Paper text:
AsfvPCNA is a hypothetic sliding clamp family protein; it is coded by the E301R gene that is highly conserved in ASFV strains. The crystal structures were determined at atomic resolution and confirmed that AsfvPCNA can assemble into a homotrimeric ring-shaped structure. Different from homologous protein structures, AsfvPCNA has a very unique amino acid sequence and conformation at the IDCL, J-loop, and P-loop regions, which are involved in partner recognition by PCNAs. Although the detailed molecular basis remains to be investigated, AsfvPCNA has a high dsDNA-binding affinity and can enhance the catalytic activity of the AsfvLIG protein, which plays critical roles in both DNA replication and DNA repair pathways of ASFV.
Using the purified AsfvPCNA protein, we performed extensive crystallization trials and solved the structures in two different forms, Form I and Form II. Form I structure was refined at higher resolution (2.2 Å); therefore, it was used for detailed structural analysis. Form I crystal belongs to P63 space group, per asymmetric unit contains one AsfvPCNA molecule. Out of the total 301 residues of AsfvPCNA, residues 4–15 at the N-terminus and residues 298–301 at the very C-terminus are disordered. The remaining residues form 8 α-helices and 18 β-strands, assembled into two domains, Domain I and Domain II. Domain I (residues 1–155) is composed of α1–3 and β1–9, and Domain II (residues 181–301) consisted of α6–8 and β10–18. Although the side chains of some AsfvPCNA IDCL residues are flexible, the main chains of the IDCL linker are well ordered in Form I structure, supported by the clear 2Fo−Fc electron density maps. In addition to the loop structures at its two ends, AsfvPCNA IDCL also contains two short α-helices, α4 and α5, which are formed by residues 164–171 and 174–177, respectively. Via symmetric operation, Form I AsfvPCNA structure can also form homotrimer. Although it is ordered in the 7DRH structure, the four residues (298NNTI301) are all disordered in the Form I and Form II AsfvPCNA structures, suggesting that AsfvPCNA C-tail is very flexible and can undergo large conformational changes in solution.
Numbering used by the authors:
A (entry chain A), B (entry chain A), C (entry chain A): 0 to 3, 16 to 297
Write the structure that this text describes.
Amino acid sequence: SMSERVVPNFERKGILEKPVRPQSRLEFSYDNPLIFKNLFIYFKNLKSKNILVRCTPTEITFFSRDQSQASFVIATIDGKNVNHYYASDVFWLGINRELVEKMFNSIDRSFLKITIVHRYDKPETLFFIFTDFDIDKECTYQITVSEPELDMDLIEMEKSISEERLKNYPLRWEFTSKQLKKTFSDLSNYTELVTIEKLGGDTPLHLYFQKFNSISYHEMYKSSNKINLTSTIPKSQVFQINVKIAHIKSLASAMVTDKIRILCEENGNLIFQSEMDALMLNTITL
Amino acid sequence: SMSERVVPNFERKGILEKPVRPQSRLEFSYDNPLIFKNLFIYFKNLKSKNILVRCTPTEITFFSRDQSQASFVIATIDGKNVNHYYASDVFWLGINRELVEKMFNSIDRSFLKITIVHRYDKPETLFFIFTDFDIDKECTYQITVSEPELDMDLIEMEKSISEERLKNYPLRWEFTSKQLKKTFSDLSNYTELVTIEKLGGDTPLHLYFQKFNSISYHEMYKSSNKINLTSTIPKSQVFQINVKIAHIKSLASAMVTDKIRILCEENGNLIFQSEMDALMLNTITL
Amino acid sequence: SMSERVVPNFERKGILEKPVRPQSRLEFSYDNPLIFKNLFIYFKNLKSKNILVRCTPTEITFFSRDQSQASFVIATIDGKNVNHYYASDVFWLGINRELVEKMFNSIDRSFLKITIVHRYDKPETLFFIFTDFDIDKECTYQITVSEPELDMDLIEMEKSISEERLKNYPLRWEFTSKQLKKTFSDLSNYTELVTIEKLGGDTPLHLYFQKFNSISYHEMYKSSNKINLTSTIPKSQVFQINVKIAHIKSLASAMVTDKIRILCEENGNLIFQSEMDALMLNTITL
């Protein structure tokens, strides 16, 4: 094609009125395939067995829970922010994560494009196409998919991440993926639980654990503006919850996105919002 | 000496009429010692036990087979393309690969020169000298070698790589070491055998495997010019062979050279030619 | 603060007349925390169980021996070469290395400052504070320390590294940490002991081992000026000792400093002096 390395001249067309191929129930193309690799490293870290996929004319969404059933994951890729998107209607698919694990891990910088196709022809087949433009090499995966495991709680977890319900969480801040990784990797060296504490007002955010007669650790954020922290905790009121380290380390080590928004409420539930390009990743740990 | 790091001022003299030292049956010197490290990483990947060495007044050749006896390796370093070469006559040596494994792995960028000396004085000793010019440090290895294991098939494998016999292979193309590594690493994630298929004419090269009800994988090269593919397969004739992944991954992971020429024939035999600087590496898998 | 990354504007004030906080028996601050990480990688490589710490109004010193009891380590950080130092008197502390192992390993480039505080308030607590200036994040470790294990030989090992006793060692040279690592890693591939030999006069330094009928290895330094070698061995006199590889590889792999001074005497005792910035590291292997 056009090479200097191949110069990537891709157009972000978004949602199309009709597919290129007539039997396509879904046509997806994206110029950032590493998004899918990091997403499924996250699914691997969570030891998720099955990935629920919902395709609508506007976006595709991947649902999953971790093995310990504590964390819920909702990853939606917006069709208007990708290079090519069409979906005929609302249909669902089920993918075994172990089957596609190595396929997603095979994504490297030699692939400038990922294509996903589902056809009425093969109702139990999902096509994944990775394209190497340096040598015009097309790598096509034929993945056998099933009709979805119902999991009716997804109707309640998609409501839990609504913006009406989100702007009432009293404590929120932002970490880079590097910062979230460092905090919860260092914490995992000594503890499985960490206390998150914040006094009402302009006091620092505190993360700490205490072990008598050996080691106590306290990490304190003395400038709330530098982590985009906002708090609605009443003055002279103490916000204090304990959260598990394991699932947060799984998301942090996956490095799925650039920045990560952390939202906390008083009964211990956290929400992690990791938005990058076309991918909006939400983690609900209850 | 002359340093800015030491400025390497080495001369490629080639073959000499007589050695520097009088008792030298073989004097070899080369300014690219990493060639030998990658060559013996390959020998290690193949689990080769013994390396057969033939020294002639024109070149030195290393023979070996893999543990499964499927692959044959012929690596010859041309005396006219190295910095210093002399050999009195045609003689053979045998090296235990396990004995010299760590020695070759010790080669790094601090060594700007490898020297190999065999003397009539010590008929069962092979000298390997690595020189660090930053501190004038000379690292000398005294390796005990044996008289060679006969292996008479080498007379038939050196004939098999003749250019008369090579230009009749109907299917050939070229991969970079990175491309050959990616193809056969990704293949090894799901299969032990891959089908190589090519229809006569200007059709794409196809590599694929099929597993019912789980995963099928197909990688297709839509531009034969971009992989230097040439085919003599008759029009409307189908070339189709199955090849083992393991031994090819061993060569690809060794990253011995820059480019790799792949030659296929209809009964499944492959030949890999990897030529870099003074080293010509041939892999015959039958 | 002042950011372009945060521009580090730290002052090296040295020793202060009185602490900032009134109850501080020791106040230590340093703008090179990676020194402590490499120091405790060394302590980990030696499998040291307990670290003896002596704090004086002029400097802080860390003592330890390796598990095999062959090597002694004396690491002193000079208070006049750090950013902030005060100590009320001469007192001693004991630290369990396993307890603080992960804490020191958590030091990365996101921390521009390490602070160590001991208070009369908490006599069995040592505070370690790492500061991330990008987000004003303060990571405080509360380490439980004990009153020191007496180990009276430290009075004899601190005398052994006196400059009066050091300038009589007949053989000394200097390696970069990369060179010391390469020599004793390559040696560890084939041997547990290496012979160090030097003939009196301007002859090369020799390091070698010999194994009959398999492999002999000889590394020779043909330019003594390039490794800053000085010898007081009488002419036509042979200096020859055998030294263990393990403990030297532990120091070399730790990469604690830039250069390393090696001192040898005729009864096999070695001394390694590794001085970097505020840290002076001495290794005595008897």
